[PDB]
């Protein structure tokens, strides 16, 4: 807390030296729409995985499968922390997220030995849950990595079913303000390009765009 100054060496250009060395150029980056309100994997940095997003099953589908279950629509819990689970979703099986990339590599007999329930067939419907729908989304990506044709995700599984207020506790790794990053300590590039990459135009909380080239606008004046 208390507004720690950060140990990065970014700086705005002064009022004395000319603007030079335009084979790198920082400018302010402003996109069209806000993405911070959206789901975490519906944001801007995950757009390329947009076709990898699992189809959504909703609350009413989950209540209908609670009341009237199907033999091959497998409800699977993807929550990892055993200290944060307090209730049982009906007709659910426990396959925690951090083991999924190993779990689908097993045979059916090894799946039965290492989890106590049968391995789902690749044509069976699989429905995944988590606290917010984040561990279930990564698990759905791991389930779609293998050739599983029908994989669905209930976004906000436990927190809407049981009414809890929990989270999957995703870190989203951001450097500590004592950790000095790469381009300050290094002779990987020449001194002009090193000074021109480390400069920015404005405060260092917003996003910027780095230009690899620039030509002078001779047609203005």
């Amino acid at each position: 807390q208390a507004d720690r100054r950060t140990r990065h060496h970014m700086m705005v250009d002064g009022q004395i030296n000319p603007r030079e060395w335009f084979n790198w150029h920082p400018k302010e980056y402003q996109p069209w729409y806000f993405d911070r309100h959206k789901f975490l994997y519906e944001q801007r940095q995950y757009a390329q995985f947009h076709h990898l997003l699992c189809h959504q099953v909703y609350l009413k589908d989950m209540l209908h499968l609670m009341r009237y279950p199907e033999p091959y629509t497998h409800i699977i819990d993807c929550r990892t922390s055993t200290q944060k689970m307090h209730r049982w979703v009906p007709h659910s099986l426990w396959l925690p997220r951090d083991e999924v990339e190993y779990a689908l590599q097993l045979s059916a007999d090894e799946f039965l030995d290492m989890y106590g329930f049968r391995k789902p067939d690749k044509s069976d419907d699989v429905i995944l849950l988590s606290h917010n729908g984040i561990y279930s989304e990564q698990a759905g990506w791991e389930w779609k990595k293998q050739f599983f044709q029908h994989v669905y995700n209930y976004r906000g599984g436990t927190n809407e079913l049981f009414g809890e207020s929990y989270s999957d506790m995703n870190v989203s790794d951001v450097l500590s303000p004592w950790k000095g990053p790469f381009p300050q300590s290094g002779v990987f590039v020449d001194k002009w390009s090193k000074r021109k990459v480390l400069t920015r135009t404005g405060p260092f909380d917003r996003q910027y765009e780095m230009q690899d080239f620039a030509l002078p606008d001779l047609e203005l004046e």
Binding site: L59, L63, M66, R67, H86, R87, V89, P90, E160, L161, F162, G163, E164, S165
Partner: peptide, 16 residues
């Protein structure tokens, strides 16, 4: 150990 304000599983369990 949790007390939720709203719940969707419990009113379906209570009728059954």
């Amino acid at each position: 150990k949790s007390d939720p304000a709203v719940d969707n599983v419990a009113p379906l369990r209570d009728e059954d």
